[PDB]
């Protein structure tokens, strides 16, 4: 669960 900005 990573924020969009992280690839």
């Amino acid at each position: 669960q990573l924020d969009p900005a992280f690839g």
Partner: antibody
Amino acid sequence: QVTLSQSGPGLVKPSQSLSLTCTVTSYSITSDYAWNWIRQFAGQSLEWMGYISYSGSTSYNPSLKSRISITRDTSKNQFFLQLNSVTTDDTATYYCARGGTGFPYWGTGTNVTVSA
Amino acid sequence: DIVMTQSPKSMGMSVGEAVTLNCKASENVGTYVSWYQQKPGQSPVLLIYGASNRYTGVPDRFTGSGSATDFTLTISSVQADDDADYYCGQSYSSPLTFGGGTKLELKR
């Protein structure tokens, strides 16, 4: 739990380039997450410099796209930041952080003064 | 990239009173706004993420609301303890950006 330590020269002359090392404890940089480099200028304003993903991908701030280079060392569990041709204006506090749900993990920061 | 503006550059309240910070995005950042607290000679600490998710071991006096372009951070009751700088960031688009920040000063 997750912890990060930045280390690097605390002084560099203009024109020269700086290299900082971020050592990560109790987590594998290959496991998951984005491994970032951020900086807070004198005025306390912050600037995201870029990151390297757990799988070798890197992303940079377009405003430093040609002076920066972030690589890693999987066997030692660390990621570096090299910034070429530094100028007085790069004097700032460099931090490394783990990206995910924002930046929940920051190193304690290491001050860098670009001066001759 | 996307500019995140923080309106009140500075501010001062008394203990017990509420405080409302504001964070604006030049464009849509869905709900990927996070709020940080930065005390004297210390590094940034994540307070809220996902626009309204109180982070681990952060007191309930801290809450967050907002969505796509307009965000706020509320501190139920201020404590002398809360002296610090508060920044906001968006992790929605390619180059992550942060607001200019807002200092909070206690009044006695």
